[PDB]
RNA sequence: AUAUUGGCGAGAGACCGAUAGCGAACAAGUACAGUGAUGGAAAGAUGAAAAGAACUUUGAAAAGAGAGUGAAAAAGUACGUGAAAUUGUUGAAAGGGAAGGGCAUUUGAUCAGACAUGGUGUUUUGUA
RNA sequence: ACGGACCAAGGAGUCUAACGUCUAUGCGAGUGUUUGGGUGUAAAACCCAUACGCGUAAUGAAAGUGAACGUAGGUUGGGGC
């Protein structure tokens, strides 16, 4: 009668497989696991973790944050890495050349990048040109900038967005919203 | 196939119109084919059965038995023949009723309305 | 004439009947789990029947093998009969119960010309 | 579909995932919002603070016509010109060619300040504006037109 | 460099007319999107019933 | 009744609205006779638009 | 013409052929290559030796 | 141009299927109960064709044994096949105030597979 | 302690409106064809105009106003390179 100090058959809390059915994703994941085996490089390991992420964990990476990376140390002539799709930031104006190795490129994004003089290569083509991740620069998306993440952790004195379709007064701005009507939260 | 909105493919409306058919449209529901002999004297292929007709059986347990019709039973959708009957155990003999689709016509009986239908269907008669 | 397999053991050989299947006309032989809170059989007591559990699984090297040592294969025609080329020592042939005595023997003779075993040669033999 | 519902996996457990003590009842604590000022203000104080009471005043017959004010910031602006004419008036920043932009035609009302643009003179016909946007417009070289 | 396809006549036979391809054939093939969307279009050509 | 952290519901269904519903199966059927009134107007109401 | 391509539009408004994410149909061809057959260290047994 | 669970005339349904679906697939709002206002059923299927039991004998009749009919009465107006409860009967077995049960084996009855394998020297064999 | 003489047929966490959690999918600062028109192999299918909801900004009771000093700052910890 062994006393298990913790818990039984507790799963790591990770995905051993993608919760997706994409035929091309079954192909993509297969080649990146081949690398996490016989190269040792920490590159193919963190990228293999992104193959099991959701759209919430794979937020759209904009080309404006990508333009910020070129103006920094080391990425002047380096290729960029994207987990998911690439969206076109109609908020920027100037941009150089460089290379992009993302999963997807939106029509708008793929246009201004290649039109400014740059290139839009898929994960697999740049994977052959950089086996262990030589000259790479990977970035993330705004996860805690979602509508849902706002309504997470709601309690008195905190301020974590209340749920309701309608905004404005008469909508939770009465008793418990002003020092006059009893109190203000 | 089905292209018109006025035609139904429903099996119930067929076995309803058939099981509750009137005698006038009953002579229609009981039409019979002619022989190659009659298909060459007129050229027509169909024509409902009547009392004064001689028809040959080419199907059933009466394979090869012809006769002259006694009285057609539209009620059950059949027809009795005096030369093709069945005997009983009490000694009484009662004729047999069958379907005219298995009975090909060899001899026909023409009248006023009969010769009019020959030309109306596309024939040459005699 | 079978493939490399050891001594086939099945553990529990007797039947797994339901509770009260020997007490009522309403109860069948099929195993139904008892959800009663005062279920003595469910509480694994001494004197009650043994409940079927996962702990009775078989080795994958002798599993599904018939009395001879061949995993069954159901056929309806001579075309699915030919599909057992390199599967003659691995599988044993058998006909369906809704077939006719005549077409089945044309397939039984075709099966012997190949080297497969038929576990039902007495199917509708009129002598 | 009824297939993927676990209710089918309760077709033996008897209770059907609703307990054995308090079980499943009609309307246990009540129907809807009943109990807010009463027995259910615990969940109201937190989560929904301010549902009861009074705000400011009443507006009789309110029409969202006087309230139609979609805003546009410094952020966009160039988005209102096709790329084939956008970079034509971009690269070559000359004078008296100041691209006249109609906010009225784009479905807008007021303008504001979000996050900079280049130093090219641009003329725009807008209704209202902001103090910050007003400043980076004089410094850029363009003017504003008063539309009604 | 188009893959090319040979033209056929009414009596079979291949014609000397080799032509290029639309390129939608060298595009993505997703049998899983079809699975879900197929169950949706089947419900489009339906009717109703009540008591 | 009052439970969890969710947006308060304002669904007005406390009536016998089981007798007040609209079936839109004739939607596509009306579109056909919609066109049959136009082809009949252009036909009955002379060669005028 | 009705579906467009790489040179023509697509005839449809706001429409453009689906985006690709891969390169080859056969992945044993990509994984094979020449640059890959070099940056990869020695292999294994394919069926582990049961030590002890 | 908007409506429509009544009437009338048509075409359909990922509807339902004789304790269903309409109360109602039939002499059905009929039988039948109630002072009455009202309430409100059970019931589809023989057989391809009644081709429906002629006829002998025993019997008061019903019928019996047969025969005949019939492709099939293990298809007969109490009719397609005919589930369980209950029952007839022969065969089996147990039983000193319950029956029946778990696990092991005795005995009764009963049943599957395995056997040939594969193959070598070969007096040389019914007709390769 | 309560129902349970027996056997069979039926027999109970549903549909749909409005949302939340998680998930896949397409597009992407836009998005939604089936509101409507065209066409027709016909309640299907395929294509389209114009608006609109939601999002792309909040803040106050309201008039009213409304996000770059700084390579969109510094510090501590930081994957990868």
Domains of chain B from N-terminus onward: 1-126 (2.30.30.30)
Distance from C-alpha of C65 to C-alpha of E32, rounded to nearest angstrom: 36
Classify burial at B21, counting beta carbons within 10 Å of its beta carbon; exposed 0-12, middle 13-18, buried 19 or more: middle
Residues 6+ apart with CB under 8 A from B98: B57, B60, B62, B78, B79, B81
For residue B94, the SS3 value is strand
Cβ pair C44, C51 in contact under 8 A: yes
Determine the distance from the C-alpha atom of residue A89 to the mean position of all C-alpha atoms in its chain, rounded to a whole number: 16
Domain range for A68 is 14-145
- D22 to chain A nearest CA, in Å? 29
Distance from C-alpha of D123 to C-alpha of D141, rounded to nearest angstrom: 9
CATH number assigned to the domain comprising residue A139: 3.100.10.10
- D13 to chain C nearest CA, in Å? 6
| A59 domain-assigned | yes
Classify burial at C111, counting beta carbons within 10 Å of its beta carbon; exposed 0-12, middle 13-18, buried 19 or more: buried
Residues 6+ apart with CB under 8 A from C50: C12, C16
Closest by Cα among D143, D57, D131 to D96: D143
| A179 domain-assigned | no
> How many CA atoms are closer than 13 Å to the CA of B57, on its beta-carbon side?
21
Q: Could you tell me the two tokens for C112?
A: 């012997």
Query: Which residues of chain F from 14 to 33 reach within 8 Å of chain E, CB to CB?
Result: 23, 25
Cβ neighbour number for residue C65 with a 10 Å cutoff: 19
User: What's the CA–C1' distance between B12 and H17, in Å?
Assistant: 15
Contact: chain E with chain G (3+ CB pairs below 8 Å): yes
Residues 6+ apart with CB under 8 A from A151: A160, A161, A162, A163, F5
Contact: chain D with chain A (3+ CB pairs below 8 Å): yes
Distance from C-alpha of C67 to C-alpha of C27, rounded to nearest angstrom: 31
- Order of strands, edge to edge, in the sheet holding A119-121? A119-121, A99-102, A80-82, A138-139
Closest by Cα among A91, A69, A72, A67 to D118: A91
What does the DSSP 8-state code read for residue F17?
Answer: T
| A107 domain-assigned | yes
For residue D128, the SS3 value is strand
Q: Could you tell me the two tokens for B95?
A: 């004729």
Per the structure, how many domains does chain A have?
1
Determine the distance from the C-alpha atom of residue D118 to the mean position of all C-alpha atoms in its chain, rounded to a whole number: 27
Q: What is the resolution of this structure in A?
A: 6.2
Cβ pair A87, A107 in contact under 8 A: no
Closest by Cα among A86, A108, A113, A85 to A97: A113
Cβ pair B62, B79 in contact under 8 A: no
User: What's the CA–C1' distance between B90 and H63, in Å?
Assistant: 20
Q: Choosing among F1, F3, F4, which should be mutated to test the D contact, i.e. which has the most D CBs within 10 A?
A: F1
Q: Which residue has the tokens 């009260």?
A: C20
Q: Domain spans of chain C?
A: 6-127
Cβ pair A52, A85 in contact under 8 A: no
Distance from C-alpha of A148 to C-alpha of F7, rounded to nearest angstrom: 13
Cβ pair A66, A137 in contact under 8 A: no
What does the DSSP 8-state code read for residue A36?
Answer: H
Q: Could you tell me the two tokens for D77?
A: 């602006």
Whole-number CA gyration radius for chain F: 23
Angle, to 10 degrees, between the axis of helix A63-70 and the axis of helix A107-115? 30
| A150 domain-assigned | no
- Chain E residue closest to A25 (CA)? E30
The method recorded for this entry reads: cryo-EM
| A68 domain-assigned | yes
Classify burial at A69, counting beta carbons within 10 Å of its beta carbon; exposed 0-12, middle 13-18, buried 19 or more: middle
Residues 6+ apart with CB under 8 A from G30: A31, A124, A128, G23, G24
Classify burial at B53, counting beta carbons within 10 Å of its beta carbon; exposed 0-12, middle 13-18, buried 19 or more: buried
Q: Could you tell me the two tokens for C79?
A: 């075309």
Instruction: Tell which phi-psi region holds residue C10, choosing left (phi > 0), alpha (psi between -120 and 50) or beta.
Output: alpha
Torsion of CA D121, D125, D127, D132, to 10 degrees: 0
Distance from C-alpha of D95 to C-alpha of D93, rounded to nearest angstrom: 7
**First-to-final CA distance of chain B:** 37
| A104 domain-assigned | yes
* F23 contacts in chain E (CB < 8 Å): 48
- Chain A residue closest to D119 (CA)? A93
Distance from C-alpha of G23 to C-alpha of A127, rounded to nearest angstrom: 12
Cβ pair C84, C113 in contact under 8 A: no
Distance from C-alpha of B49 to C-alpha of B105, rounded to nearest angstrom: 8
Distance from C-alpha of G4 to C-alpha of A133, rounded to nearest angstrom: 37
> How many CA atoms are closer than 13 Å to the CA of A81, on its beta-carbon side?
18
Is strand I within 7 Å of residue D15 (CB)? yes
Instruction: Kindly state whether F7 is in contact with chain A, defined as any CB-CB distance less than 8 angstroms.
Output: yes
Q: Choosing among F6, F7, F9, which should be mutated to test the A contact, i.e. which has the most A CBs within 10 A?
A: F7
Distance from C-alpha of B42 to C-alpha of B81, rounded to nearest angstrom: 25
Closest by Cα among A150, A175, A173, A176 to A163: A150
Q: Which residue has the tokens 């109401």?
A: F45
Cβ pair A39, G40 in contact under 8 A: yes
Buried b / exposed e over G17-45, threshold 16 CB at 10 Å, is eeeebbbeeebeebbeeeebeebeeeeee
Cβ pair B96, B84 in contact under 8 A: yes
What does the DSSP 8-state code read for residue A60?
Answer: -
Residue C63 to residues C7, C58, C69, C70, Cα–Cα distance (Å) = 11, 6, 9, 9
């Amino acid at each position: 009668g062994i006393d298990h100090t913790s818990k039984q058959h507790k799963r790591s809390g990770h995905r051993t497989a993608p919760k997706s059915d994409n035929v091309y994703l079954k192909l993509l994941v297969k080649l990146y696991t081949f690398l996490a085996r016989r190269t040792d490089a920490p590159f193919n390991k963190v990228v293999l973790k992104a193959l099991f992420l959701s759209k919430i964990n794979r937020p759209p990476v904009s080309v404006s944050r990508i333009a910020r990376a070129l103006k920094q140390e080391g990425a002047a002539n380096k290729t960029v890495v994207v987990v998911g799709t690439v969206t076109d930031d109609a908020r920027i104006f100037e941009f150089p050349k460089t290379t992009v190795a993302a999963l997807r490129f939106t029509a708008g994004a793929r246009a201004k990048i290649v039109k400014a003089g740059g290139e839009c290569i898929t994960l697999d083509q740049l994977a052959v040109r950089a086996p262990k991740g030589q000259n790479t620069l990977i970035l993330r998306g705004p996860r805690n900038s979602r509508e849902a993440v706002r309504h997470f952790g709601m309690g008195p004195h905190k301020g974590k967005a209340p749920r309701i379709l309608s905004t404005g007064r008469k909508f939770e701005r009465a008793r418990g919203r002003r020092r006059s009507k009893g109190f203000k939260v | 196939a089905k292209q018109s909105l006025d035609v139904s493919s429903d099996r119930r409306k067929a076995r309803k119109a058939y099981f509750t058919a009137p005698s006038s449209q009953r002579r229609v529901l009981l039409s019979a084919p002619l022989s190659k002999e009659l298909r060459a004297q007129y050229g027509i292929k169909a024509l409902p059965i009547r009392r004064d007709d001689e028809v040959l059986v080419v199907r059933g347990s009466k394979k090869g038995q012809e006769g002259k019709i006694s009285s057609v039973y539209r009620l059950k959708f059949a027809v009795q023949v005096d030369k093709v009957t069945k005997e009983k155990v009490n000694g009484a003999s009662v004729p047999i009723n069958l379907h005219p689709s298995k009975l090909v016509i060899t001899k026909l009986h023409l009248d006023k309305d009969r010769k009019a239908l020959i030309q109306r269907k596309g024939g040459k008669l005699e | 004439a079978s493939l490399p397999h050891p001594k086939i053991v099945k553990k529990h050989t007797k039947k797994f009947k339901r509770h009260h299947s020997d007490r009522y006309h309403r109860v069948a032989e099929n195993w139904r789990k008892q959800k009663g809170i005062d279920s003595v059989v469910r509480r694994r007591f001494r004197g009650n029947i043994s409940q079927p559990k996962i702990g009775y699984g078989s080795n994958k090297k002798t599993k599904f093998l018939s009395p001879s040592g061949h995993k069954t294969f159901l056929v309806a025609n001579v075309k699915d009969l030919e599909t057992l080329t390199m599967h003659t020592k691995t599988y044993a042939a058998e006909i369906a119960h809704n077939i006719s005595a005549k077409n089945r023997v044309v397939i039984l003779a075709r099966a012997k010309a190949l080297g497969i075993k038929v576990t039902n040669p007495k199917g509708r033999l009129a002598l | 579909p009824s297939r993927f519902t676990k209710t089918r996996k309760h077709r033996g457990h008897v209770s059907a995932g609703k307990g054995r003590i308090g079980k499943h009842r009609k309307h246990p604590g009540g129907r809807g919002m009943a109990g807010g000022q009463h027995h259910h203000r615990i969940n109201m104080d937190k989560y929904h603070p301010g549902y009861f009471g009074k705000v400011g005043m009443r507006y009789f017959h309110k029409q969202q016509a006087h309230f139609w004010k979609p805003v546009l910031n410094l952020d966009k602006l160039w988005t209102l010109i096709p790329e084939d004419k956008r970079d034509q008036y971009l690269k070559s920043a000359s004078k008296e060619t100041a691209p006249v932009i109609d906010t009225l035609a784009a479905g807008y009302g007021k303008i504001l300040g979000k996050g900079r643009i280049p130093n090219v003179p641009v003329i725009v016909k807008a209704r209202f504006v902001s103090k910050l946007a007003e400043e980076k417009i004089r410094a850029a070289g363009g003017v504003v037109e008063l539309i009604a | 460099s188009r893959p090319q396809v040979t033209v056929h006549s009414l009596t079979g036979e291949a014609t000397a007319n080799a032509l290029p391809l639309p390129a939608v054939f060298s595009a993505p093939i997703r049998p899983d999107i079809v699975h879900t969307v197929f169950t949706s279009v089947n419900k489009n050509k339906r009717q109703a019933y009540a008591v | 009744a009052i439970s969890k952290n969710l947006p308060i519901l304002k669904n007005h269904f406390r009536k016998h609205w089981q007798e007040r519903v609209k079936v839109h199966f004739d939607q596509a059927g009306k579109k056909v006779s919609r066109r049959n009134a136009r082809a009949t107007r252009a036909a009955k109401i002379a060669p005028r638009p | 013409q009705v579906w467009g391509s790489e040179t023509v539009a697509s005839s449809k408004v706001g429409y453009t052929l689906p985006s690709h994410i891969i390169s080859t149909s056969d992945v044993t061809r990509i994984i094979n290559s020449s640059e890959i057959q070099s940056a990869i260290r020695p292999a294994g047994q394919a069926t582990q030796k049961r030590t002890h």
